[PDB]
Amino acid sequence: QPVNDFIDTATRHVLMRQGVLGIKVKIMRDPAKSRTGPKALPDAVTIIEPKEEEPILAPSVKDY
Amino acid sequence: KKVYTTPKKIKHKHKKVKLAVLSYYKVDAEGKVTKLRRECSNPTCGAGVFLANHKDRLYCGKCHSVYKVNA
RNA sequence: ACCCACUCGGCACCUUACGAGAAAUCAAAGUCUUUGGGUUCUGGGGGGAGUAUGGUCGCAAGGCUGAAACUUAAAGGAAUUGACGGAAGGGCACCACCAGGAGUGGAGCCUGCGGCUUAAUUUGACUCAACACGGGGAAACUCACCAGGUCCAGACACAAUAAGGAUUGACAGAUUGAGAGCUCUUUCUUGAUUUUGUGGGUGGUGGUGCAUGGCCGUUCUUAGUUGGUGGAGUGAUUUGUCUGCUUAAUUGCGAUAACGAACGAGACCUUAACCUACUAAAUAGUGGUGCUAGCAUUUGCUGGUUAUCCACUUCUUAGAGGGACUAUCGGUUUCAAGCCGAUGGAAGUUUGAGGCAAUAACAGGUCUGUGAUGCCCUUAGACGUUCUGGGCCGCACGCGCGCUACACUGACGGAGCCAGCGAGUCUAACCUUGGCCGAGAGGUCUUGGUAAUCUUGUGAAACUCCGUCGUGCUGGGGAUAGAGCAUUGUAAUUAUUGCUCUUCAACGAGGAAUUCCUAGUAAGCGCAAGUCAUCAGCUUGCGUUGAUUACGUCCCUGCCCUUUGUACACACC
Ligand SMILES: [Mg+2]
Ligand SMILES: [Mg+2]
Ligand SMILES: [Mg+2]
Ligand SMILES: [Mg+2]
Ligand SMILES: [Mg+2]
Ligand SMILES: [Mg+2]
Ligand SMILES: [Mg+2]
Ligand SMILES: [Mg+2]
Ligand SMILES: [Mg+2]
Ligand SMILES: [Mg+2]
Ligand SMILES: [Mg+2]
Ligand SMILES: [Mg+2]
Ligand SMILES: [Mg+2]
Ligand SMILES: [Mg+2]
Ligand SMILES: [Mg+2]
Ligand SMILES: [Mg+2]
Ligand SMILES: [Mg+2]
Ligand SMILES: [Mg+2]
Ligand SMILES: [Mg+2]
Ligand SMILES: [Mg+2]
Ligand SMILES: [Mg+2]
Ligand SMILES: [Mg+2]
Ligand SMILES: [Mg+2]
Ligand SMILES: [Mg+2]
Ligand SMILES: [Mg+2]
Ligand SMILES: [Mg+2]
Ligand SMILES: [Zn+2]
Structure with a gap:
């Protein structure tokens, strides 16, 4: 197709x-x-890129 | 293929003859004119056209064929 | 005698390569343009030719020595990629076999091909990849062929004729198959549109498909093609693209001087399968209710009513989504990709079936699809065109595709009674319900439908049921032939097709051989569509009934891959 x-x-x-x-x-x-149809080949497989995290940190909680 | 056959005799064509024709009026002693060969009474052949005399036969050639007036 | 270490000298092998080479390779073929250790011998493009001649040796056959004239642009070496083989090793497949099915091959006819015959029986195509193919079912037309008859639709340019008429047409007769003024008699008409010639065009189902385009078929039911960065090589190239394994697949896993990718495969697309979830429907349908019929009556059962109302969307339709990813679990395997089994599931064989489909090859087929086309041919007594008539069907025979059969799992007669894919009439006569008439084929009067609305629930056929027949060429089978009736068409003779009575052939399961096929498939069975005025024993599709037998291998056949040889490369034609 x-x-x-x-x-x-x-x-x-x-x-x-x-x-x-x-x-x-x-x-x-x-x-x-x-513009008016598939914007890529049926082939195309894009993986979205993760973000380098700065995790750790013992609990804590915000108030509002 | 083959090329040619024939037991002779080729067909010709037509002539339409010669004739310095229209002498077929008669103009008298200065200068009355009397048309020979009677003319044709069709609405499409305004009297300028004439009838040819064959046998029985008088004929309007102007009517490319048509109509067969006879006297 | 044997074991270990060492050492001279041998026959060799292994591994590297500093080094050498045009490479193949080479401890010499190294220590060479950074060119010299000593010495012998031979070669100087290919043929002519180890030929002629002279000398010499020999019994001979012949040995040694050994020219030229002339000819010629290459001959030759090593390696690379292809192509090919009547070499080797692996694979793959019902256009292969295994296990089987249903057959064809035997018969009658239908139909193409050859052959013969013919005025002509127009023609292309001849292993798979010609022969129910050219959508090729030809009564005219089609039409290309044969017997014959008209017409020019011969642009344009120059010239000639020529208004004292270039040319045009014709009634009747003759003629002709013809109510063709074709030609001829005869004598009008027409008015510069023609006619003559030269040049130039023009048409053509004329030739060339071995000049071409385009399209198509085949290789291919195949799995192959390429580039980046790295590795090897002076180079063309190679590696990547590979022993194995795995897959329908260069599909992957894995091994790995490769790493990571692109074309093709896959993905994608279409169709068939699942949605009591979503949006709806008097051109689909359901439940209820009014109106109403029949039977029972105790409420019940079975129908009628394009709108008498109400509600719904299960069934039908088609939009949007959802769904499956070989899932879960297990066995097997290098516990890799995968394969296998059980459960669940609408669905688990690429989900089933298709569409699309790289690079490359062929003198495959098509100039007869084309106002696609080069060149050649022909062009007015036409190979242009049209009109009449015949022919493509012609029949000692060979070959292919088919149809119907040899019956009793059947034929016949009554009765049951169920699909799916389609298609249909405007400036027209297409799909046809209903009513009558007719034994039938058909006829006739009306009617609905440009269509989910009408034909049509296409009430199709196999099929099922109760009967007749009873193994007898029988009532299996229906060739051939007679006689009548109708339909299409201008036309039915060489019988278009349909119907009725009669006639009642071969064929009693088919030698050697050969075809197709793995699940809603094979086989049986009809139907719609293409063609079509009329004609399907053909095709393209469609649903109906519904199996037996594998779920394997390399024996046969065909192909693909590697290895290997090549003096081929226009490539074993
Ligand atoms: Mg080679
Ligand atoms: Mg077998
Ligand atoms: Mg058999
Ligand atoms: Mg030819
Ligand atoms: Mg004709
Ligand atoms: Mg001329
Ligand atoms: Mg000429
Ligand atoms: Mg032509
Ligand atoms: Mg060709
Ligand atoms: Mg071609
Ligand atoms: Mg197969
Ligand atoms: Mg290099
Ligand atoms: Mg390779
Ligand atoms: Mg529904
Ligand atoms: Mg199950
Ligand atoms: Mg050829
Ligand atoms: Mg063509
Ligand atoms: Mg024929
Ligand atoms: Mg065939
Ligand atoms: Mg019956
Ligand atoms: Mg009657
Ligand atoms: Mg109407
Ligand atoms: Mg009998
Ligand atoms: Mg019978
Ligand atoms: Mg038909
Ligand atoms: Mg046909
Ligand atoms: Zn007149």
């Missing part, structure tokens, strides 16, 4: 003197920019 989503194809027949040749163009658009 990402094919249907992200690549655009086109063939054109260019007609010269000795015969004809076919042009075949492929473009793969950046999925991150997709």
Whole structure:
């Protein structure tokens, strides 16, 4: 399916003197920019990065 | 393939003949004019067109074919 | 005699490489552009050729010595990647086998291919990867073929003819298959649109698919392709991408001069499965209630009523979510990836089935799908086109796909009586309910539907039930043929199809061989759709009934991988 989503194809027949040749163009658009669909490949697996903690500290409690 | 056959005799075409035609009026002793060959009474053939004389046959060529007036 | 240490001198092997090499390799092939220890011998691009000639040795065969003219741009070495093998080792698969199923191969016919025949029987394609394929079911059309008849739709440019008319058409007759003015008779009409020629175009199911595009098929039911940083190598390259294991998978684990990644696989997408949870529905349906029929009556049972009202969304529909991740537990395994079993679960074989699908190869098929196309051919007595008629169906025969059968697990006759995927008429005659008529096929009058609304609950067929028949070519089987009736169409003859009576063939389970297949699958069974005016024994799908037997291996066949040889690289054609 990402094919249907992200690549655009086109063939054109260019007609010269000795015969004809076919042009075949492929473009793969950046999925991150997709704007109106999947913003990535189904492949993509992003892990969010944890934060270095400064734990310890025996109890304590705030008041409000 | 093959090329050519034929038991002879090729068909020709048409001529449309010659004729320095329209002499078929008669202009008299200066200078009355009397049209030979009677003309055609169709709403589409304004009297300028004439009838050809065959046998029985008088015929409006102007009507590309049509109508068969006979006297 | 044996064991240990040492030492001269041998035959060799192992490991490294400081060092050498174009490399393969090499304790010499090292101590060489930082070029000299002593000495012998041979080579100077390839052929011509170890040939000619002379000398010499020999019994001979022949040995030694040994040219040139001429020719030629390479020949040659080592290593690398491919490609290929009638070498070796592993794998994988019902287009392989095992265990079996159902068959085809034998018969009748249907249908394609060959062949023959023919005016013509248009044509492409010939192992898997040609032969119910070209969506190719051809009565005209299609149509390309054959017998014949018209027309130009011959742009444009130059020139010629020529308004004293370039050219156009025609009624009747003749002619013609023809109510074609094709041609001819005859004599009007037309008015610069043509006609003649040259040039240039134009069309063409003409040729070339060994000139091409595009598309498609095949290799492939396959698992392969690449780059960064590091390692090896002068280099092309290699390692990564690998012994093993594992997987449907270069799928992973693991080993590891590699580490970490990208294409392809996977993911993804579609469809089939589960939602008494969510949003709803007179184009889906349920319960209640009104109105109402039948039977029972003691409340009951079974129906009717596109709106008489009320409520719901279980069933139907389709939006949004949810669900499974081989989960839990266990056995096995390098307790690795994984495989196996039990439980649970709608679901645990990639959940089932598909869509998509890298790099590369082929002189695979297609110029007959294209107003896609180069080149060649042809272009008015046409290979353009159209009209009439025939032909693609022609029948001693060979080959393939099929259909129907040889019956009693059946045929026939009554009766039961249940799907799913579809499709349908506007400037038109498509899907057809209902009513009559008709033995049937059909006819006729009306009708609903541009459709979850009507056809249609598509009341399909196998199937189930009670009967007749009773193993007899029988009432199994229905080829062939006669005679009538209807439908489609302008047209049915070489019988389009449908119906009725009659006729009643081969075939008594099929030699050698050969095909497909592992679960709602095989096989049986119909239906819708494509084609379609009319014609399915074809296909694409669909649901209905529903098994036997594996759950393995490498014997056969096919392919893929490694190792290995190569003088191939236009690559064993
Ligand atoms: Mg080699
Ligand atoms: Mg077997
Ligand atoms: Mg058998
Ligand atoms: Mg050919
Ligand atoms: Mg014809
Ligand atoms: Mg010309
Ligand atoms: Mg010419
Ligand atoms: Mg053409
Ligand atoms: Mg080709
Ligand atoms: Mg091609
Ligand atoms: Mg299989
Ligand atoms: Mg280097
Ligand atoms: Mg490799
Ligand atoms: Mg529901
Ligand atoms: Mg269970
Ligand atoms: Mg070829
Ligand atoms: Mg083509
Ligand atoms: Mg044919
Ligand atoms: Mg076939
Ligand atoms: Mg019956
Ligand atoms: Mg009657
Ligand atoms: Mg209506
Ligand atoms: Mg009998
Ligand atoms: Mg019978
Ligand atoms: Mg049909
Ligand atoms: Mg067909
Ligand atoms: Zn007239």
